[PDB]
Amino acid sequence: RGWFDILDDWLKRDRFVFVGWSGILLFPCAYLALGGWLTGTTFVTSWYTHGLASSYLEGCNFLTVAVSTPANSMGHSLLLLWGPEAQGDFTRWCQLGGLWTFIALHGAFGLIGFMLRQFEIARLVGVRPYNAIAFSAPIAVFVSVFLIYPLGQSSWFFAPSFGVAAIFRFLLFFQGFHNWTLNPFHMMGVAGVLGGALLCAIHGATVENTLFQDGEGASTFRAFNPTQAEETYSMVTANRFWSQIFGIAFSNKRWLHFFMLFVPVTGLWMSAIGVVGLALNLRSYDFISQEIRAAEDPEFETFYTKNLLLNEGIRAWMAPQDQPHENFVFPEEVLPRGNAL
Amino acid sequence: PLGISGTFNFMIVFQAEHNILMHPFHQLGVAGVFGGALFCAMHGSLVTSSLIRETTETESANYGYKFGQEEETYNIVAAHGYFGRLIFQYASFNNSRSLHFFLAAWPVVGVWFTA
Amino acid sequence: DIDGIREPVSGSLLYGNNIITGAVVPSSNAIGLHFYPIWEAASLDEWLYNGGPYQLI
Amino acid sequence: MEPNPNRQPVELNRTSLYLGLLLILVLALLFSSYFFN
Amino acid sequence: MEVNQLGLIATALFVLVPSVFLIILYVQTESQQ
């Protein structure tokens, strides 16, 4: 019973906010990531890395503020405050994009802390660690999109910037440059997120509409007790309803709730894999057979060829302002445009 | 269009003409759909986390539940005690009816708005 | 001819599409919001050129 | 020498078969377009 | 259309090999019962 066990005792005390050993990593990193974002979106510009205003101080609103990525010229520099680029100058560090790596790196370690927290509390309370396991999906998304993806590209500049409209820009970039909607790993992600949301709604509605009458009030919430042994709704009536409405139904409560874990987690894992591919420009951009036919046959047109015309417009029209370090000068005569527009 | 690439065509053109990404009802739709996926995974992981031991390690735990059995197959108070400490106590449900109503309402209301 | 400009879009598998690129194409912009059932067309061939199946479905 | 005691039967119920065949057929439907390219 | 020729055998084994695995396991389960 030395200092270590005494410290263990204090860290694991049942208090309003559980701390634990994981809290030592989690609480500083989460708070700094969050405070970095709020500090940057309130006060910090993107003029020198992006040519953009991005803070409330400059006139932006909640949709257009952002902590933007560092300039492309920074490469994948860690951009430490004390590093060779900022050289300890806080002001210059902000102007060069240091808050972006600050938030991304402290966010990464905060995510680790939170998942360690899930393990720590699950072990102390005595339950299985499936909530921790499920949280692997948000982690894979964060690391593949914010870290692996720019690491395969020229610099952090092309990672997502932390902002509402800046993420919207990131969506449209991926359509125009990667044709990301055509990627089957994204499509599996879509099916997992929409399938998750479907499962969420249909399970909640089913329970609420197969409730047992356990009280006399018109508000049915009061007729449940968290220590009651009995199921609060009829699995048997739910199963018959869905069997006759949809053809199949769940019959196993354990399988149902595992499946609810399984679907959205697996979807997010799949999209992460596709973004790893996009780190290398290993896109699912084209269908070779379509391009061969269309090149030789000017009357052949599909929704596939129509969408590429849209991507080509996106690229030419946003690249000069979106990649200012390339100094793209596109004279009006080279811009792709349909008739009149 | 009734097709996969046609859907994406519809989306891209919609954004050019309506800036739907910058429309709050679509933003509420994303929160309904992101949050629905989140709460799906949360609820599934919390129930799965607190299944009562009913099987050996050589069998699927799923056989611990029999269709139409009268007792619950997991321990909601253990689930509440885990999740209330993961956040704090009053951010965790211990009424199953309230919880399942929340599960239904969040993605339904989000998708109404995006509709 | 979804956009009514006599520029037909190929939507079906047998006309050079795959599962990802194929579609039932919306009805002609020349029709607008007019109702276009089969019996309003001079022939099925007309009804298919103008995107009649989309409306039926 | 005794026969190995660690051997165990393996099971796949009919519902799992249905779920697995649907997964494989839908995966095939999704990826085939890219295999043909 | 000029599609990848190996696409056909790739698709067929992609379907056939995991499906046959599942069928084997199911049928031998039924005959235990």
């Binding site: 199963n239 | - | 598998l13 | - | 599609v3 056909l8």
Partner: peptide
């Protein structure tokens, strides 16, 4: 050959629906 392949897979899924619905493991209570 690719048209034949896409329609074949689709037809298999429809047949699977038939068996999954009408030849399911019947849920038996308790």
């Amino acid at each position: 050959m690719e048209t034949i392949t896409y329609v074949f897979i689709f037809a298999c899924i429809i047949a699977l629906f038939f068996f999954a619905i009408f030849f399911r493991e019947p849920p038996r209570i308790t």
